[PDB]
Design a protein around this ligand. Structure first.
Ligand SMILES: Nc1ncnc2c1ncn2[C@@H]1O[C@H](COP(=O)(O)OP(=O)(O)O)[C@@H](O)[C@H]1O
Ligand SMILES: Nc1ncnc2c1ncn2[C@@H]1O[C@H](COP(=O)(O)OP(=O)(O)O)[C@@H](O)[C@H]1O
Ligand SMILES: Nc1ncnc2c1ncn2[C@@H]1O[C@H](COP(=O)(O)OP(=O)(O)O)[C@@H](O)[C@H]1O
Ligand SMILES: Nc1ncnc2c1ncn2[C@@H]1O[C@H](COP(=O)(O)OP(=O)(O)O)[C@@H](O)[C@H]1O
Ligand SMILES: Nc1ncnc2c1ncn2[C@@H]1O[C@H](COP(=O)(O)OP(=O)(O)O)[C@@H](O)[C@H]1O
Ligand SMILES: [Mg+2]
Ligand SMILES: [Mg+2]
Ligand SMILES: [Mg+2]
Ligand SMILES: [Mg+2]
Ligand SMILES: [Mg+2]
Lengths: 21, 371, 371, 371, 371, 371
């Protein structure tokens, strides 16, 4: 996978937090 | 206030504000002190130089690293490196910025305590945390499941993780990394008479290692090819313009990661310790660890290291397993990028060690809260 | 409103609306709780996994079954399994749907009372009933007369019935079923070194049991054949791609149903307890019980179990009796299909425990109305 | 001719003639092979060293144990250990002396077969037997009834016995023993920076474990005391005279027997598996098992382990039961002493596997005669 | 035929037949060429003089050493030194006598190859070998285990050995030896105006170094004593009868072995590199290395060097360790005596490089066989 | 009061107040004593003449230099030269003016001590210092880093410096300078019969050397050109009007700096000793030494010496290195200008040897404070 921003990666972990919730 | 991420790994400090894509201060974790007489007055001739200052003066300084095998051995100089990091490079007063430190796993609790003491009593920082570097390396790769293989300047460690839930019994740490590779490269460059012995020369052989070395895909056949032909030889120009030429040393140096017995290290190689770490994991999750090998740290940057690692684990692991290695670009900075994610993550703001908790519980608090 | 059928048997919940041909929710009656240190953030907010979710995370969870030997031992987790069944799988509010539970016979009245309390006070259900699983198993076959052999995950029981009129003195329950078969299979797989010890591995040996095992028609000659030739050996692939090979263990495992002394269980085998149950029946009806053995429950699914059972009872029963075994397809779901019939039978709508009767009589009501 | 008893347990071989009060050869079950170059000719520099030879040369050898978790993994080196046992330590030709081997229960039949092959075809021994170590441990105490807890270097197992008649369904084996304790002690000694990584260092941490460690009577309060005061700290001197100091690690190490989750082992502790083994026994005999717990094996030698075990089982077992633990002195050698009794018992001389029976029946004979 | 041992170390050739107790040819490894005009015909005025010829003509020759820091820099003159060694001093034809050469460790493979080429193609010798000088130095002491510290004219190196099995990762070589001591002695003798600048004067200051210098036991107090009193001053008579007087220079010269920073060398001192070499060894063997420090080479001949080395290592090493230094008489010749042993050892006659092996494999063979 | 700088180098005294751009007293360091009878009374006929006095009377005086090879040989006459410098030339009382002396490096400590004694006890000066001439020569250029090549009347020396921090092991001093050039010029002018033998004639050949001589760019081709054509010949007029003509002597004289063997000096030339001095420096700084060769002293004034030096070092140094020579105008006075800077630098006023420190510590103080 190509480089992606921390601004992008954070929202993946916020989405995964909502999935774990 | 925007959080602060300071990867006091070995060899290079990576530091910068949280939420940035890359560390805005990267410099060597070196303190250098003048080696010779002080003949020429009319200058500050200052007692100590750190980072790029020390590199710019390399050949008159006794360079020293105050963190060795991921362990801070020399707190008086490490506190100079932190002072330089905060006040000269980042140009920020730490008493406004909560600082995410990080360290290797399986590391003396005295270190984590002294880092806590120094951060809360020298720099008065509002809050602090000490994440495991390999856990950060998953955040940088957007993963939630995988083995992480971090291979730094001073230590190499494996941490398997599955939807969270790091398996602490399956963690392994090797004490073999880029310094042992540099010193072995010096030992084998002695075999054709480039005598490097000073720490300045150690710092040049680090550059030779970074520029020329690569990992052989098939070490016996690469060794035979370098014996039969000069095609693998490369020429490099020393700071004084003396040309050197290097051959089978070019891949014999990083091969010691896969064959530690070359440096007399007894341990299993990095492929074997990766496999044995997966073998310490419960049998259900191994397929996803094989599918999610994450590589991080500067000594994973060697060309072909991912191909060699995949070959070796595919030889170790059962024939059906889809062995995959996530070794992206910028994996050198992945520990810092993972800290830049974690320190800015909205759920992590519960996790800081506040200074009130330190005033209540002393250095012992950082064993209770941090993993 | 359409009735609701929830077969909280052991091992698997089967649940679904009455009148459906098959249970639309089938999932393991497992609650799993994390075993390890949760280092990443994005976990731990959810701290208990149920059913197929516990299978999807098998290798990081301490799996537990809250119903053991057909007895609910752990009401706090069983109430989680019921919550999951109603709200997540069937996606229905139980306060509109009368729920047919079912349980094994000869079972502590404290269980039937706590199930009543939970159904009427946690889920507020309009009405409830607790049918005997073997009585349900007749409806799915269409019999009115027969031996029922139910053999579940936790218990095995025989209930003879004749035009109605279950003979309560001739009921027998064995406490030997698929969990004892799994644990004995683990004990004998240890004989060639596949060490399974975790509950995740118990859950894999359950799959090995379901995929490979079968019941020998002539155990001594099958054992001699497996000793003399590898033709009976089968290979299976573990979740990590490690191949295992299995031989006489393949039929020695389910043979323990016919020879409980293999697991140290004292009792007579399932053929002998079937015969002794017929021998407790009045001598006029025995010919129709021999002509109507009904087999149900998942551990009756083994290939050849009907042939072995017929051989053994034909050796036990008098030479004239036409021993016949009704072991159809889907006999794994026959208890649920029988509940789907009964709950939708127009004659049965008198039989529900209404919530008014519970408000008048407390848990004791379910001993007065239900058989 | 006087029989021969050779306890090839893990970690230490105990061997000697039957009827002796103590094994006259006790040495570590280690094979070591030179790690480094062969620089200095004029010496045999021999290819392999075993036992005390390997300990005397520890720091230049890659030590390996050919028996792992009570399972012989490396027959080529185990046959060297047997050769050393017979010809160098006991100084006897096995073709005159019938040899009582012993092994742990619930152990791969391939091991018992390969031991049979090796004894009858390499050493030509007149006769052989393979007693279960826990059954032997009764003879050394003089009991006829009890639940034996053997806890070795590689395995721990419980075997309840009543006037004879070992209950094979109630046997349990844990795969947790002194090696897992050594490796966890290494992991926690890393917490204050004594990095032990070589097998020589593993062999030193085994000595630290034997000299310093003890089992806490009340682990939470001992942990709090070691946190509040240095009174529990002890100093030990490494082979090079470097002093180390050890504190809560001193009892956190053997505590993992009671809390296997410290090493990530999921299983119940040794007190819980002892209780569950008694709970697998028929309800009449439990009172005499509680009255006759027999402890054996080197990892039962920890100070206070009997007191802690008695506390934990008295908390588990019903309040009336007279929980008693028979943990005598020399219980480290009780398995050998039990073999020295059994091999010299006149009733046992019927029981040997004769070489004629092996020539008739191959390795399979040792499953038919031996328990 | 009796073997031949030719220690082409730096500064002095030691040569003689194997089995002799002492080298029968000891002479300086010097080639001298006439510096001035050729005024006086009627003489050969020959182009070159070597050894004692060059010393006897010292003041008209530009003396040069063709081996520098253990590395042969000048093969055209080294081949003259070998010719002189064989034909003029030993008076023997090398084509009958297999020649044991020796060299320092960690030395360019081009040297070992060119020595092989020269021995097999110029001198046609039947066989050859190239032992490490420190490995030879054990044989002359009779040890099998120890650190060897060899300190020659051109190089100093540490090699730890244990029952054999030299630890190649713990070898260290310092590039500081008697020439650096001579040049520093010249630099400090300049401090009171004895200007020595010619190579003839370098060769006289070598004699002053050998005759007068000693190693201070407590350098600060010896320096203060030489500052406070003339009692430490000694007078020496130059070849022309000019008296010189020497004071604190007498021990400041060899002190640079312990404080290399005096010559601007950055490396740790010889005591520190001895300790660090023991610290590279596995922790079990360190006690026997401390018990077996072997000193060899001419620059270990200074009075008091053993006492100073013992004091310094006893300050470095743990207080319990029995630090012992084996610095016998004739330790100047111990490398040759060790070669005289090894070349006459009957086990060694397998080890020679035969000329057939060179004709098959060229110079590369001497990396395969020799250590 | 403004400090005083008195460069008692060889051949010429340069003296003057600090802060002046050029020394206001420059005169030869000569003492002359009447050679002949005292025939003519009525005059003082005074016993001694110094400086321009001695030059004005040259042909009746036995001229002598009291400083030889940078070493003061004749303190009774040097004290006359200092007396003349202070009282007759500068016309100042030294007891008000702290005096910065200077001397060459690697010079007998007896000189620095006697200069200290004389300054503090004959001239009662308030304070004194003794800077190394080459360190002063940097200040006049404005460098902080460089090779300094000082080439005086009596000595030539190389001192490498880097941001300060003179490397004392890499200093070299040659004892070859303008007096050896004068004496060789006299020896070769004898080849066409200009017999110069008196010290007056030595003082005339010094003028011939300064006026006519130059350094050949390509000595072999200049020698061939002077052999083939008279174009290189120059005519000079002696004080008595005798014309002399000079040819290949014109560049053969200063060529001896590059080929000391012409005067029988064995040492490497000034280009070779410059390169070898850079080669004693650590490999990182060599590029800045090549970029910063500083030339100073009167014998660097020869036309073409910078071009020849650049050619020779560019032939010696690696092809990439940007060899640059800083040989400015007034480099004859650069040592004095550097003293005029240093003595007026405000940071230096800490560095003076005060007379209180001399009264406390005697001549030994000037080894402790001064470099
Ligand atoms: N491009 C490269 N190729 C090979 N090695 C590299 C490269 N870049 C850095 N390294 C090596 O990686 C190490 C530094 O890695 P780093 O990640 O900064 O350490 P840490 O993990 O302790 O922060 C050094 O040994 C350095 O020589
Ligand atoms: N096809 C099959 N072959 C063998 N065993 C099976 C098969 N299907 C299910 N089982 C076993 O039957 C048991 C589950 O039966 P089930 O009827 O769901 O229990 P219950 O009667 O309590 O509802 C488990 O032990 C499972 O392993
Ligand atoms: N006094 C002691 N205290 C604690 N541990 C001990 C003691 N003696 C032996 N051990 C440990 O017990 C193990 C050896 O037990 P042993 O009975 O010889 O094994 P096995 O049962 O396989 O023969 C080793 O791990 C050793 O460290
Ligand atoms: N008695 C002595 N005291 C001090 N130094 C000595 C003595 N004898 C020899 N040396 C010095 O030792 C060096 C020669 O040692 P040697 O062992 O011959 O060298 P190598 O090890 O290369 O053969 C020379 O520097 C010499 O000056
Ligand atoms: N222009 C010149 N050309 C050649 N040689 C010169 C020149 N000027 C001075 N010299 C020589 O340089 C020497 C004086 O140099 P100087 O720097 O005054 O000595 P010091 O370095 O001891 O002060 C004398 O030998 C003089 O002949
Ligand atoms: Mg890092
Ligand atoms: Mg069922
Ligand atoms: Mg045992
Ligand atoms: Mg030598
Ligand atoms: Mg000068």
């Amino acid at each position: 996978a190509p480089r992606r921003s921390v601004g992008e990666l954070r929202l993946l972990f916020e989405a995964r937090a909502a999935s774990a919730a | 206030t925007t959080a602060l991420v300071c990867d006091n790994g070995s060899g290079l400090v990576k530091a910068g504000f949280a939420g940035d894509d890359a560390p805005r201060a990267v410099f060597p974790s070196i303190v250098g002190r003048p080696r010779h007489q002080g003949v020429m007055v009319g200058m500050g001739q200052k007692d100590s130089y750190v980072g790029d200052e020390a590199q710019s003066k390399r050949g008159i300084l006794t360079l020293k690293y105050p963190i060795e095998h991921g362990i801070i051995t020399n707190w008086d100089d490490m506190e100079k490196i932190w002072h330089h990091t905060f006040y000269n490079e980042l140009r920020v007063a730490p008493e406004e910025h909560p600082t995410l430190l990080t360290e290797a796993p399986l590391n003396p609790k005295a270190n984590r305590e002294k880092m806590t003491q120094i951060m809360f009593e020298t720099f008065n920082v509002p809050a602090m945390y000490v994440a495991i570097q390999a856990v950060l390396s998953l955040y940088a790769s957007g993963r939630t499941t995988g083995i992480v293989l971090d291979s730094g300047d001073g230590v190499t460690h494996n941490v398997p993780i599955y939807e969270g839930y790091a398996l602490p019994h399956a963690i392994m740490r090797l004490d073999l990394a880029g310094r042992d590779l540099t010193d072995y490269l010096m030992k084998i460059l002695t075999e054709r008479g480039y005598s490097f012995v000073t720490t300045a020369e150690r710092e040049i052989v680090r550059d030779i290692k970074e520029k020329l070395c690569y990992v052989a895909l098939d070490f016996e056949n690469e060794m035979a090819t370098a014996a039969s032909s000069s095609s693998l030889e490369k020429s490099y120009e020393l700071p004084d313009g003396q040309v050197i030429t290097i051959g089978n040393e070019r891949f014999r140096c990083p091969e010691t990661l896969f064959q530690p017995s070359f440096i007399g290290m007894e341990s299993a190689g990095i492929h074997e310790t990766t496999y044995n770490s997966i073998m310490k994991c419960d049998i259900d999750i191994r397929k996803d660890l094989y599918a999610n090998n994450v590589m991080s740290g500067g000594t994973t940057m060697y060309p072909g290291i991912a191909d060699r690692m995949q070959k070796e684990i595919t030889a170790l692991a059962p024939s059906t397993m889809k062995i995959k290695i996530i070794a992206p670009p910028e994996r050198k900075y992945s520990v810092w990028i993972g800290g830049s994610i974690l320190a800015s993550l909205s759920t992590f703001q519960q996790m800081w060690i506040t200074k009130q908790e330190y005033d209540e519980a002393g250095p012992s608090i950082v064993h209770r809260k941090c993993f």
